[PDB]
Amino acid sequence: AKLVCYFTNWAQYRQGEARFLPKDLDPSLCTHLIYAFAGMTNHQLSTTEWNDETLYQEFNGLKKMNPKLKTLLAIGGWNFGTQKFTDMVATANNRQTFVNSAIRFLRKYSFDGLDLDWEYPGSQGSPAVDKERFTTLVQDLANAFQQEAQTSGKERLLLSAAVPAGQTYVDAGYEVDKIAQNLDFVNLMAYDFHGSWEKVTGHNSPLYKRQEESGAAASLNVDAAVQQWLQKGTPASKLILGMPTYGRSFTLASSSDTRVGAPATGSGTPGPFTKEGGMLAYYEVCSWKGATKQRIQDQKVPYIFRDNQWVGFDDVESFKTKVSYLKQKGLGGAMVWALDLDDFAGFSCNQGRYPLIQTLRQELS
Numbered sequence: 001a002k003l004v005c006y007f008t009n010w011a012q013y014r015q016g017e018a019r020f021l022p023k024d025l026d027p028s029l030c031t032h033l034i035y036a037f038a039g040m041t042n043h044q045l046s047t048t049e050w051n052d053e054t055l056y057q058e059f060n061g062l063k064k065m066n067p068k069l070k071t072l073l074a075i076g077g078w079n080f081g082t083q084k085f086t087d088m089v090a091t092a093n094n095r096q097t098f099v100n101s102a103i104r105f106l107r108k109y110s111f112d113g114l115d116l117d118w119e120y121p122g123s124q125g126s127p128a129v130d131k132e133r134f135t136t137l138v139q140d141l142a143n144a145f146q147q148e149a150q151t152s153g154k155e156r157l158l159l160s161a162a163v164p165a166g167q168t169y170v171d172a173g174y175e176v177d178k179i180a181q182n183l184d185f186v187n188l189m190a191y192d193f194h195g196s197w198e199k200v201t202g203h204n205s206p207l208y209k210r211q212e213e214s215g216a217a218a219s220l221n222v223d224a225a226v227q228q229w230l231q232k233g234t235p236a237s238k239l240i241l242g243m244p245t246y247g248r249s250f251t252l253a254s255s256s257d258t259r260v261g262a263p264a265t266g267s268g269t270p271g272p273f274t275k276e277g278g279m280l281a282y283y284e285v286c287s288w289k290g291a292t293k294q295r296i297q298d299q300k301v302p303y304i305f306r307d308n309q310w311v312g313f314d315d316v317e318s319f320k321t322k323v324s325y326l327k328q329k330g331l332g333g334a335m336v337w338a339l340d341l342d343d344f345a346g347f348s349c350n351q352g353r354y355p356l357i358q359t360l361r362q363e364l365s
């Protein structure tokens with residue numbers, strides 16, 4: 001089984017005990033570490049933070065303590081120039097520029113592969129034709145990585161992609177059966193299913209639907225997303241189930257209505273460390289005093305509320321349930337966003353180091 005864990009190069013700016021650098025990573029925790037995020041300059045892979053060259057060398061240096069570990073660099077994310085992927089995939093020449101730059105850049109810094117995090121071909125400004133051009137990009141990368149291994153004599157570079165759970169993004173952007181052949185594994189982003197863009201509370205990452213949900217709402221859950229990716233042709237062994245070490249928060253319209261589906265007036269108050277309305281790290285929720293925690297019976301995940309604040313998040317028990325689920329489906333392992341949002345140094349939750357991600361490591365064993 002794989003345990004694919006994401007590092008973020010902006011967690012180094014979090015205050016106090018929440019600051020996260022490569023020295024905070026446990027080299028033995030995961031099987032694959034993915035560095036988020038690289039950028040793109042004139043169709044070439046490029047750094048995004050002043051110290052990326054130094055952090056890359058500390059990150060890949062962790063393979064000295066765990067030689068089984070593989071590392072990848074993720075390109076893209078949710079803050080990204082709106083035309084960069086589209087212009088790069090638009091021509092064979094620009095795809096060649098990108099592929100050749102990726103090989104040189106990954107080898108220079110000792111990464112073992114590339115993770116594609118385009119949000120998203122065919123949606124959010126990206127034209128309909130990018131669905132097919134994304135397939136060509138994936139083919140071009142796979143072909144060039146195969147050839148480079150033979151010329152260089154190194155291990156062939158790995159290729160993965162982070163893919164959406166939402167049905168309309170999947171249909172608009174991905175020739176699932178074609179790309180799954182050329183990708184070594186597929187990181188399913190099984191989270192962000194509900195959020196403060198909605199006028200009622202809902203869980204970030206529920207496993208199943210609620211009885212009351214039907215139509216399109218009945219597909220806003222992990223099981224529906226996994227079934228769509230499998231039914232469209234992803235081999236089960238290549239599908240890696242994403243897990244969130246964060247939750248999504250709401251301000252309730254009234255403190256007396258706290259149910260799932262209760263009216264909400266906007267995002268929950270920003271957390272003290274992550275400072276972003278609507279989201280909270282696990283270490284910001286796990287500790288709340290004077291709160292009430294409940295489980296959503298049909299969806300197998302918890303929420304917690306206090307006064308007019310309501311947060312859907314994942315705990316040790318829901319991570320255990322989701323690993324049981326992925327094993328029942330024969331999936332290739334679990335993926336986690338993100339290392340720096342778990343209680344990575346045992347400073348908040350009274351559950352030791354990495355309580356959520358260590359649960360995955362043990363249950364996948």
Ligand SMILES: C[C@H]1CN(C2CCN(c3nc(N)n[nH]3)CC2)[C@@H](Cc2ccc(Cl)cc2)CO1
Pocket residue numbers: 006077078117162187189192242246274276279280281335337341
């Ligand atoms: C706009 C969304 C974006 N969303 C990302 C989740 C990981 N996603 C992904 N996973 C892989 N494998 N690649 N990219 C990409 C989307 C969350 C990012 C987040 C922000 C703050 C805090 Cl505290 C927790 C989380 C919530 O806000």
Ligand code: NA
Pocket residue numbers: 164165166169192
């Ligand atoms: Na989605």
